[PDB]
């Protein structure tokens, strides 16, 4: 009966904290600020709390308890969290047992929203027992405490006691960590058993006789489908594809489980189903409205089946469909496709809207096309009243306006943006659309013409017209002759600079930059993100170097030796090419010395790892002809080699890094390769370069139509960015290139530089957006035809560079936020921009002197 439908979590399947960083009223990435208060605590436990961890521990006496075992996990619903903690550390208090809890209300929301960990859900309060008799006595006394309480979320990770919030699972008590993988356990053997944490209850094959054991005292309107795949699973639940037995009906169950899945108005998963349901009832007669096919309970879930639409949601029609690539005179087809969409579109919320139900989400992911492209509306969770004024729990930045108060407006604001989105398919933030409407409606015009361009505006206007029925709302003027792209490298490096020069932090950051400034070790410091970039791009430009060196003197060499990491891009090493250059030279001769030791190991990325490093180390030895950093790059080629030879596949740490490419591939590793030739003469690092490239370019596919080169990951996505994509291959095959005197990969060289014919990307930035491109002309020698290249990818650089005062400043990712990082913001592009005027597409990499690194290592 049960077991059907856990196991359904069991099926296979096939940038969110950019909202933690929207803190009002700052052009700028700035995080969201925000307690479980006991008293009478005896004087025989200790009470902290974790470094950085959502653990409040309860510490007994002066006890040991085993480092694995069989643990107590107790769940809670949100409004009995205080009232179930009160009863149940009362009791292990007064039994001396050692437990933990999430320590405040924002902890027990993030382990229980609607995109939490399925595995960690739920898991409010741990409790220790010191062996396995304590164990067994607790679940009952727990159980017995708690038992006059409203069930709360089940833990997908351990077997329920009966029919308890008391919940059971055999694990770490400690967290035992190896080489090759995260918490574990000990065996009986060779000790290095992994500790699972799964959506499914698993029994180490060691202790599965008491498991057995506890099962002992341990006291279908489904059935009609055959459930084939999983489309996605959240906390809240899965979504599953079906087929109505007997029938052979094509469906989509939505499953609810009850008290999981909290949102940002503390609702849960059946409170969004049951009014997804309403919704979908009140719209069963509007005919673009998915239409629902039955409601059941099965167990303890909810489950919600709805018609399966045939098709694709707008952001896969834009991905798949968009005129992306400049084929010479062809966007005609698109403004048909455009209008057919919209004008479905607009017909489609009049109706929704006429039976008094506004969607709540009208955005892209929302709006599905078929393949004669009728326009139907999915995802009826966020659906309100019109007229209502309620907060909405949850917002797509892009195409919300907090200028928006009802909800049937709000439905029209997204309309309106979707409108011009899919003319441009480029993000937006409402903090930065003052500016970006004005670069987005120029580019329209410019590309589709003044007829589509009126098209826009008109209906735009409509929209404009629709909110103001619903309330007070009264739009900024137009004249987009305010507005000028700049085609002149010098000038907008130059006010690029100044833009920089005015958004200077006074903090440790130096600069704004992307959120990893703020999510990652070293962010504030170190070259991707954190203040040494801009120091480095403005000591390029000779400006502010009053504060730079205060910068330097007060704020970063009180870091530098604290920063554990040695990555070029994320650790030391990106910072000593700084400090060199700005004459700190005993500095980084102590730090080279520390180099050797700590941690030359397995991570091999020109991001983080030995490559990057390496590269570095070489452009020292360069500068200086002390022999002991040529000793240091060979010993990090050994290294690298038995990285390789102990397994190929590469790990990721940055949820935007892909195994593929410069920045954190092969082609990346290649780099150091070709600079080691360049240092040695030694053929065989050439050989080795030749090879590492060799192998990233069987990760790239040929469009047949369009003859553009991209990498393809493990996803089957397409990639053209610096990170990730094929414009950071061909620099290494480029610089290949230059040290060898050769033209290898000429072939797919030419159908990489075919990408400065894009159109629009959806950000901007040097490494995972429109930044890339600017590399695009730097690998050109010829004069005439960079000239085209270049002028196309400054086409799709304006859609970007912001005017702001008489200067210019550079959107971050998604262009929510402003970024002056080289990861995002302007520093990056300055830096690429640069390396335009100067021939010269490694620009971007934090090496010694870098003005002179291509010259010094040329064949
Ligand atoms: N009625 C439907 N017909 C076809 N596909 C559907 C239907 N309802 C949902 N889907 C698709 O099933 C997948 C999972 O739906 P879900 O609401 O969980 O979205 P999700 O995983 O958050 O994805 P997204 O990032 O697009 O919102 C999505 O690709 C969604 O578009
Ligand atoms: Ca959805």
């Given at each position: 009966?049960?077991?059907?439908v856990?196991?359904?979590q ?30 009478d605590?005896?004087?025989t ?44 550390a ?23 929203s ?12 741990t409790?220790?027992?010191t062996?396995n ?13 708690i ?7 089940y833990?997908?990770?351990?077997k329920?006691?009966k029919?308890?919030?008391v ?6 008590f ?10 574990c356990?000990r ?13 499914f ?22 059935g ?20 109505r ?15 999981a899945?909290?949102?940002?108005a ?9 009014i ?24 303890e879930?909810?489950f ?6 045939e ?8 991905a798949?469909?968009f005129?992306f690539?400049?084929?010479?005179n ?18 489609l ?10 969607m ?13 492209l ?18 909405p729990?949850m917002?797509?930045?892009?195409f919300?306006?907090h ?6 407006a709000r ?13 441009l398919?480029?993000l ?9 409407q004005?670069?987005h409606?120029n ?18 206007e ?12 009264i ?20 006010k ?13 950051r ?6 990893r ?15 040494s ?52 030279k ?13 941690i030359?190991?397995?991570?091999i990325?020109?991001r ?8 570095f ?26 990285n ?48 590492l ?7 790239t ?41 050769q ?8 159908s ?10 959806i950000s ?7 930044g890339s ?7 050109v ?9 270049l002028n ?12 702001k ?30 390396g335009?005027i100067?021939?010269?597409?490694l ?8 003005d002179?690194?291509?010259?010094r290592?040329k064949?």
């Amino acid at each position: 009966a049960m077991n059907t439908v856990l196991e359904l979590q069991k099926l296979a399947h096939d940038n969110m904290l950019y909202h933690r960083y929207l803190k009002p009223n700052s052009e700028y990435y700035k995080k969201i600020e925000v307690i479980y208060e006991l008293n009478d605590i005896p004087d025989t436990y200790a009470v902290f709390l974790d470094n950085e961890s959502v653990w409040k521990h309860y510490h007994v006496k002066g006890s040991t308890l085993p480092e694995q075992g069989w643990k107590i996990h107790v769940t809670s619903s949100l409004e009995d969290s205080k009232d179930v903690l009160d009863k149940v550390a009362r009791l292990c208090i007064d039994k001396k047992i050692e437990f933990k809890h999430l320590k405040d209300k924002d902890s027990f929301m993030k382990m229980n929203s609607k995109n939490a960990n399925r595995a960690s859900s739920g898991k409010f309060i741990t409790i220790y027992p010191t062996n396995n008799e304590v164990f067994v006595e607790l679940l009952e006394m727990i159980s017995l405490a708690i038992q006059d309480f409203k069930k709360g979320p089940y833990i997908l990770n351990d077997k329920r006691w009966k029919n308890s919030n008391v919940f059971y699972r055999y694990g770490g008590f400690k967290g035992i960590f190896n080489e090759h993988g995260e918490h574990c356990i000990r065996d009986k053997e060779g000790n290095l058993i992994k500790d699972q944490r799964n959506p499914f209850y698993q029994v180490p094959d060691f202790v599965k006789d008491f498991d057995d054991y506890l099962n002992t005292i341990n006291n279908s309107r489904l059935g009609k489908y055959k459930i084939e795949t999983a489309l996605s699973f959240s906390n809240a639940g899965g979504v599953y594809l079906a087929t109505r037995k007997k029938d052979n009906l094509k469906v989509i169950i939505k499953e609810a489980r009850p008290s999981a899945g909290l949102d940002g108005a503390a609702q849960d998963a059946l409170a969004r189903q049951k009014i997804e349901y309403d919704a979908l009832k009140k719209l069963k007669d509007v005919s673009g409205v998915v239409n629902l096919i039955e409601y059941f309970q099965e167990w303890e879930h909810y489950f919600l089946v709805e018609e399966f639409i045939e098709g694709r949601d707008l952001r896969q029609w834009i991905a798949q469909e968009f005129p992306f690539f400049e084929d010479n005179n062809g966007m005609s087809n698109h403004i048909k496709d455009v209008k057919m969409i919209l004008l479905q579109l607009l017909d489609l919320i009049d109706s929704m809207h006429n039976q008094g139900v506004a969607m709540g989400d009208l955005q892209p992911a929302n709006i599905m096309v078929t393949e004669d492209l009728t326009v139907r509306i999915i995802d009826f969770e966020t659906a309100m009243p019109v007229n209502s004024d309620d907060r909405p729990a949850m917002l797509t930045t892009g195409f919300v306006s907090h200028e928006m108060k009802v909800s049937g407006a709000r439905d029209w604001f997204g309309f309106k943006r979707l409108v011009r989105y899919l003319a441009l398919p480029v993000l937006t933030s409402e903090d930065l659309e003052g500016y970006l409407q004005y670069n987005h409606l120029n580019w329209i015009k410019e590309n589709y013409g003044y007829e589509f361009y009126s098209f826009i505006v008109d209906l735009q206007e409509k929209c404009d017209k629709r909110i103001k029925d619903y309330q007070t709302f009264i739009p900024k003027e137009i004249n987009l002759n305010d507005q000028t792209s700049d085609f002149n490298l010098t000038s907008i490096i130059n006010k690029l600079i100044i833009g920089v020069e005015s958004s200077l932090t006074n903090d440790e950051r130096f600069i704004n930059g992307d959120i990893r400034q703020f999510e990652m070790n070293g962010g504030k410091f170190n070259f991707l993100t954190g203040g040494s970039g801009a120091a480095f791009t403005l000591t390029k430009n000779k400006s502010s170097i009053a504060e730079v060196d205060k910068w330097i003197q007060s704020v970063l060499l009180d870091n530098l030796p604290l920063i554990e990491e040695d990555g070029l891009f994320t650790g030391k090493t990106g910072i000593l090419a700084l400090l060199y250059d700005k004459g700190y030279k005993e500095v980084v001769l102590n730090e080279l010395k520390i180099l050797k030791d700590n941690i030359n190991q397995t991570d091999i990325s020109i991001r983080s790892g030995l490559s990057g490093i390496g590269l570095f180390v070489i452009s020292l030895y360069l500068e200086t002809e002390n022999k002991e950093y040529l000793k240091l790059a060979k010993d990090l080629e050994r290294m690298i080699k038995l990285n390789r030879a102990k397994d190929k596949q590469l790990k990721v740490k940055d949820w935007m890094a892909v195994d593929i490419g410069v920045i954190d591939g092969l082609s990346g590793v290649s780099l150091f390769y070709s600079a080691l030739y360049s240092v040695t003469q030694n053929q065989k690092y050439l050989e080795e370069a030749e090879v590492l490239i060799k192998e990233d370019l069987e990760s790239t596919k040929k469009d047949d139509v369009t003859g553009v080169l991209q990498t393809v990951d493990n996803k089957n996505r397409l990639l053209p960015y610096l990170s990730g994509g094929s414009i950071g291959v061909a620099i290494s095959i480029w610089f290949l290139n230059h040290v060898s005197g050769q033209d290898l990969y000429r072939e797919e060289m030419n159908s990489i530089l075919k990408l400065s014919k894009t159109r629009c990307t959806i950000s901007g930035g040097l490494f995972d957006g429109a930044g890339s491109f600017l590399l695009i002309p730097s690998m050109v020698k010829n004069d005439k035809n960079r000239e085209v290249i270049l002028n196309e990818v400054l086409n799709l650089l304006n859609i970007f560079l912001i005017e702001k005062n008489s200067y210019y400043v550079y959107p971050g990712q998604f262009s929510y936020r402003l970024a002056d990082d080289v990861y995002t913001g302007s520093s990056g592009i300055i830096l690429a921009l640069m390396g335009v005027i100067k021939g010269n597409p490694l620009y971007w990499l934090p090496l010694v002197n870098s003005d002179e690194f291509l010259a010094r290592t040329k064949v």
